[PDB]
């Protein structure tokens, strides 16, 4: 009851993050970095996924918030080689590029040196590590292209 000293004992929503419904990019301060995308490029699908899991678990143990873990579209490139005593290119092998991205935020400037040192020391063979600041273009690169929108935009140009 309101007048009783036990008023408000049942309150619970002040302990819960307000969830009242794409995502705004939060730039970091002078001492903390903003949203960061940790790209993992490799020719082996297992290596890319396994290291992304390792990075995701590493951040949790380091109390670093992980915004989102997702996979970039697979790139398939044909590999052709020139035949001996010939001028014709013949297909040799097919290579698929797999990219895994782990999105983190709130990284401290002083702690960035330690975090980058640990991840680069554990990088598997054949895996490329690239850490970039999150931008709108990178997020928009995960969506299908819209030729119909482009065609209408060309008329306006």
């Amino acid at each position: 009851y309101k007048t009783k000293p036990t008023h408000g004992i049942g309150k619970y929503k002040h302990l819960i993050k307000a969830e009242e419904p794409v995502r705004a990019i939060n730039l970091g301060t002078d001492y903390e970095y903003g949203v960061l995308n940790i790209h993992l490029t490799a020719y082996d699908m297992t290596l890319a996924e396994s290291y992304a899991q390792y990075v995701h678990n590493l951040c949790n143990s380091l109390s670093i918030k992980v915004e989102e873990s997702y996979a970039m579209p697979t790139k398939t490139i044909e590999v052709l080689q020139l035949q001996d005593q010939g001028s014709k290119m013949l297909l040799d092998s097919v290579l698929t590029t797999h990219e895994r991205v782990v999105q983190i935020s709130g990284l401290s400037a002083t702690f960035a040196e330690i975090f980058l040192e640990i991840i680069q020391s554990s990088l598997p063979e054949g895996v490329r590590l690239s850490v970039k600041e999150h931008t709108e273009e990178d997020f928009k690169g995960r969506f299908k292209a819209r030729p119909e929108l482009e065609e209408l935009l060309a008329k306006l140009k």
């Binding site: 143990s61 380091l62 002083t110 702690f111 040196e113 330690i114 040192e117 640990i118 554990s122």
Partner: protein, 52 residues
């Protein structure tokens, strides 16, 4: 093809040894992060006293 009793026993013991091996790897990595963090924080404190 069904695995033999000896084959299953070998894998089970290997997995048990694998758990301890990965635990020691985490301890070495966790201590490595702690060692770097303690040194960096101590260095910053010394630097602040010398020249803010």
């Amino acid at each position: 093809v069904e695995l033999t009793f000896e084959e299953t026993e070998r894998r089970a013991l290997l997995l048990k040894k694998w758990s301890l091996y990965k635990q020691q790897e985490r301890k070495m990595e966790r201590d490595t992060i702690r060692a770097m963090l303690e040194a960096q924080q101590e260095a910053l404190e010394e630097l602040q006293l010398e020249s803010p």
